[PDB]
């Protein structure tokens, strides 16, 4: 079947994790460049509002990405989504997006797997299994999106079905 390579960048389990198609990195790649470049010159963004896109500093990597916001705290805080990278975050250092880079579409994808792929024993220990290789290069079948836009997939690992790659199930 089409297999596309991606990185994991989050995962909280089977049904909920976040890839980065090989295919956006460049896109990615860009989008990071020239965020970068005009970082320093971006006004603050105060319309704190649940669903909002700006720019967000990760204040675990001080680095600012595009961000969304999901709900909105006290003190300035905001919790927000990096739509990029598919992590969340409460910061409060917000600064507003140029219309032109809230044009491409978010480069981290949600995805769920296909139930029917793994067994118990393979859900239990993908957990300890990705965690191990973050950095690694997976394949995954897109088998549909969801009105959500959420990937419901079939994942591999050196091309291989993951079920088989976990030994100790």
Avoid: W
Wanted: some cysteine; glycine content about 4%.
């Amino acid at each position: 079947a089409e297999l596309h390579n991606c990185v994991v960048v989050q995962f909280d389990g089977p049904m909920s994790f976040y890839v980065q198609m090989e295919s956006d990195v460049p896109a990615l790649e860009q989008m990071t460049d020239k965020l970068l470049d005009a970082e320093q010159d971006l006004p603050a963004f105060s319309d704190l509002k649940e669903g909002a896109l700006c720019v967000a500093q990760f204040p675990e990597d001080e680095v600012f990405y595009r961000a969304q916001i999901r709900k909105v705290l006290d003190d300035g805080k905001c919790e927000v989504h990096f739509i990029d990278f598919g992590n969340n975050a409460v910061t409060q250092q917000f600064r507003q997006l140029p219309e032109e880079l809230a044009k491409p579409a978010r480069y981290s994808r949600h995805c769920e797997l296909d139930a029917s792929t793994i067994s118990k024993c393979d859900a239990a220990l993908l957990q300890s299994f990705i965690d191990t290789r973050f950095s690694e290069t997976f394949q995954v079948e897109i088998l549909a999106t969801k009105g959500t836009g959420t990937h419901v997939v079939r994942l591999f690992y050196q091309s291989k079905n993951i079920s088989e790659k976990l030994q100790e199930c």
